Design an enzyme around this catalytic site. Structure first.
Site, PDB file in Angstrom:
ATOM      1  N   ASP A  47     -11.364  65.928 -14.965  1.00 55.62           N
ATOM      2  CA  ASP A  47     -10.766  66.139 -16.281  1.00 55.62           C
ATOM      3  C   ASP A  47     -11.665  66.020 -17.522  1.00 55.62           C
ATOM      4  O   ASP A  47     -11.159  66.171 -18.653  1.00 55.62           O
ATOM      5  CB  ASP A  47      -9.520  65.232 -16.449  1.00 55.62           C
ATOM      6  CG  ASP A  47      -9.853  63.739 -16.417  1.00 55.62           C
ATOM      7  OD1 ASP A  47     -11.004  63.369 -16.717  1.00 55.62           O
ATOM      8  OD2 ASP A  47      -8.953  62.928 -16.103  1.00 55.62           O
TER       9      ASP A  47
ATOM     10  N   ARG B 261     -11.776  66.356 -22.976  1.00 55.51           N
ATOM     11  CA  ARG B 261     -10.907  65.656 -22.052  1.00 55.51           C
ATOM     12  C   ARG B 261      -9.639  66.503 -22.015  1.00 55.51           C
ATOM     13  O   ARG B 261      -9.100  66.877 -23.071  1.00 55.51           O
ATOM     14  CB  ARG B 261     -10.602  64.256 -22.592  1.00 55.51           C
ATOM     15  CG  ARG B 261      -9.583  63.435 -21.796  1.00 55.51           C
ATOM     16  CD  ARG B 261     -10.013  63.279 -20.346  1.00 55.51           C
ATOM     17  NE  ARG B 261      -9.180  62.334 -19.612  1.00 55.51           N
ATOM     18  CZ  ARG B 261      -7.968  62.601 -19.126  1.00 55.51           C
ATOM     19  NH1 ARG B 261      -7.418  63.794 -19.290  1.00 55.51           N
ATOM     20  NH2 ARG B 261      -7.304  61.663 -18.464  1.00 55.51           N
TER      21      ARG B 261
ATOM     22  N   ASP C 208      -4.257  63.564 -15.683  1.00 58.67           N
ATOM     23  CA  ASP C 208      -5.217  62.570 -15.250  1.00 58.67           C
ATOM     24  C   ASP C 208      -5.672  62.754 -13.803  1.00 58.67           C
ATOM     25  O   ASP C 208      -4.885  62.627 -12.867  1.00 58.67           O
ATOM     26  CB  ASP C 208      -4.701  61.147 -15.462  1.00 58.67           C
ATOM     27  CG  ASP C 208      -5.787  60.096 -15.234  1.00 58.67           C
ATOM     28  OD1 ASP C 208      -6.971  60.348 -15.557  1.00 58.67           O
ATOM     29  OD2 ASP C 208      -5.461  59.012 -14.726  1.00 58.67           O
ATOM     30  N   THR C 209      -6.929  63.158 -13.639  1.00 60.74           N
ATOM     31  CA  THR C 209      -7.496  63.291 -12.312  1.00 60.74           C
ATOM     32  C   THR C 209      -8.035  61.898 -11.983  1.00 60.74           C
ATOM     33  O   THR C 209      -8.327  61.094 -12.894  1.00 60.74           O
ATOM     34  CB  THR C 209      -8.656  64.309 -12.259  1.00 60.74           C
ATOM     35  OG1 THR C 209      -9.628  63.995 -13.261  1.00 60.74           O
ATOM     36  CG2 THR C 209      -8.147  65.706 -12.472  1.00 60.74           C
TER      37      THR C 209
ATOM     38  N   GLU D 134     -10.334  58.695 -10.947  1.00 62.39           N
ATOM     39  CA  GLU D 134     -11.602  58.162 -11.401  1.00 62.39           C
ATOM     40  C   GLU D 134     -12.681  58.209 -10.328  1.00 62.39           C
ATOM     41  O   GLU D 134     -12.396  58.067  -9.135  1.00 62.39           O
ATOM     42  CB  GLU D 134     -11.380  56.711 -11.836  1.00 62.39           C
ATOM     43  CG  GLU D 134     -12.549  56.075 -12.545  1.00 62.39           C
ATOM     44  CD  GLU D 134     -12.885  56.791 -13.825  1.00 62.39           C
ATOM     45  OE1 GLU D 134     -11.973  56.986 -14.664  1.00 62.39           O
ATOM     46  OE2 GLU D 134     -14.061  57.172 -13.981  1.00 62.39           O
TER      47      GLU D 134
ATOM     48  N   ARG E  88     -13.847  62.381 -27.790  1.00 68.79           N
ATOM     49  CA  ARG E  88     -13.723  63.532 -26.888  1.00 68.79           C
ATOM     50  C   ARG E  88     -12.692  64.521 -27.432  1.00 68.79           C
ATOM     51  O   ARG E  88     -11.664  64.112 -27.976  1.00 68.79           O
ATOM     52  CB  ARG E  88     -13.276  63.090 -25.495  1.00 68.79           C
ATOM     53  CG  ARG E  88     -14.227  62.152 -24.810  1.00 68.79           C
ATOM     54  CD  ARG E  88     -13.785  61.801 -23.398  1.00 68.79           C
ATOM     55  NE  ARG E  88     -12.526  61.059 -23.369  1.00 68.79           N
ATOM     56  CZ  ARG E  88     -12.006  60.494 -22.281  1.00 68.79           C
ATOM     57  NH1 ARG E  88     -12.642  60.576 -21.120  1.00 68.79           N
ATOM     58  NH2 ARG E  88     -10.833  59.878 -22.348  1.00 68.79           N
TER      59      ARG E  88
HETATM   60  C1  LIG Z   1      -5.747  62.573 -22.188  1.00 66.39           C
HETATM   61  C2  LIG Z   1      -5.963  61.452 -23.236  1.00 66.39           C
HETATM   62  C3  LIG Z   1      -6.658  60.332 -22.985  1.00 66.39           C
HETATM   63  N1  LIG Z   1      -6.724  59.318 -23.909  1.00 66.39           N
HETATM   64  C4  LIG Z   1      -7.319  58.010 -23.584  1.00 66.39           C
HETATM   65  C5  LIG Z   1      -6.365  57.158 -22.842  1.00 66.39           C
HETATM   66  C6  LIG Z   1      -7.284  56.244 -22.072  1.00 66.39           C
HETATM   67  O1  LIG Z   1      -7.885  55.206 -22.895  1.00 66.39           O
HETATM   68  P1  LIG Z   1      -8.486  53.847 -22.246  1.00 66.39           P
HETATM   69  O2  LIG Z   1      -9.792  54.238 -21.735  1.00 66.39           O
HETATM   70  O3  LIG Z   1      -8.549  52.939 -23.392  1.00 66.39           O
HETATM   71  O4  LIG Z   1      -7.503  53.517 -21.224  1.00 66.39           O
HETATM   72  C7  LIG Z   1      -8.349  57.174 -21.612  1.00 66.39           C
HETATM   73  C8  LIG Z   1      -7.940  57.821 -20.294  1.00 66.39           C
HETATM   74  O5  LIG Z   1      -8.910  58.825 -19.963  1.00 66.39           O
HETATM   75  P2  LIG Z   1      -9.803  58.877 -18.653  1.00 66.39           P
HETATM   76  O6  LIG Z   1      -8.924  59.465 -17.569  1.00 66.39           O
HETATM   77  O7  LIG Z   1     -10.957  59.772 -18.964  1.00 66.39           O
HETATM   78  O8  LIG Z   1     -10.128  57.461 -18.465  1.00 66.39           O
HETATM   79  O9  LIG Z   1      -8.427  58.137 -22.674  1.00 66.39           O
HETATM   80  C9  LIG Z   1      -6.256  59.483 -25.175  1.00 66.39           C
HETATM   81  O10 LIG Z   1      -6.506  58.769 -26.118  1.00 66.39           O
HETATM   82  N2  LIG Z   1      -5.522  60.556 -25.405  1.00 66.39           N
HETATM   83  C10 LIG Z   1      -5.317  61.590 -24.519  1.00 66.39           C
HETATM   84  O11 LIG Z   1      -4.610  62.544 -24.856  1.00 66.39           O
HETATM   85 CA   LIG Z   2      -9.320  60.653 -15.416  1.00 68.25          CA
END
Ligand SMILES: Cc1cn([C@H]2C[C@H](OP(=O)(O)O)[C@@H](COP(=O)(O)O)O2)c(=O)[nH]c1=O
Ligand SMILES: [Ca+2]
Length: 135
Positions: free
Chosen positions: A15, A29, A34-35, A37, A81
């Site tokens: 993702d 992103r 959510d794919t 980790e 991102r």
């Molecule tokens: C998809 C997305 C992710 N995020 C944030 C939530 C998560 O924050 P935290 O890292 O603080 O948990 C993280 C999840 O993405 P990843 O799947 O890349 O980790 O990115 C947003 O702020 N808004 C969004 O629309």
């Molecule tokens: Ca992810």
């Protein structure tokens, strides 16, 4: 919403990827999904993470054209991102992943949820078919 051209620089995982957007490299992103980790030690390599990365990589690397589509709310997250729906030759990567059961609909923050129902109908079909994540 409106699509805008971009150029693939590097696919990172299922993702997240780096794209040249408006003559500037930046990481994107995928919105609403959510794919699993594969980088963070706190989560470790989650089941299907590698599979999701490979699927996305193939899809974006073999595309003749990549387009990004921002939603109506914020365009970047706290990590800087870009938040978008990404299309590879007119096919939405976000949906493709969910349809295969390689991603779950997540992080639904309004007003950035224009395609929420479409992605949910796809996720239901994947679960229905017991695919990967839903197997
Ligand atoms: C998809 C997305 C992710 N995020 C944030 C939530 C998560 O924050 P935290 O890292 O603080 O948990 C993280 C999840 O993405 P990843 O799947 O890349 O980790 O990115 C947003 O702020 N808004 C969004 O629309
Ligand atoms: Ca992810």
């Amino acid at each position: 919403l409106h699509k805008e051209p971009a150029t693939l620089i590097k696919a990172i995982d299922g993702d997240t990827c780096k794209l040249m957007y408006k003559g500037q490299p930046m990481t994107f992103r995928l919105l609403l999904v959510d794919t699993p980790e594969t980088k963070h030690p706190k989560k470790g390599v989650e089941k299907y993470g590698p599979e999701a990365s490979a699927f996305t990589k193939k899809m974006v690397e073999n595309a003749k054209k990549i387009e990004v589509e921002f939603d109506k709310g914020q365009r970047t997250d706290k990590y800087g991102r870009g938040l978008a729906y990404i299309y590879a030759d007119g096919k939405m990567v976000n949906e493709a992943l969910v349809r295969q059961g390689l991603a779950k609909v997540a992080y639904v923050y309004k007003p950035n949820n224009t395609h929420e129902q479409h992605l949910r109908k796809s996720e239901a079909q994947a679960k229905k078919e017991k695919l990967n994540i839903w197997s």
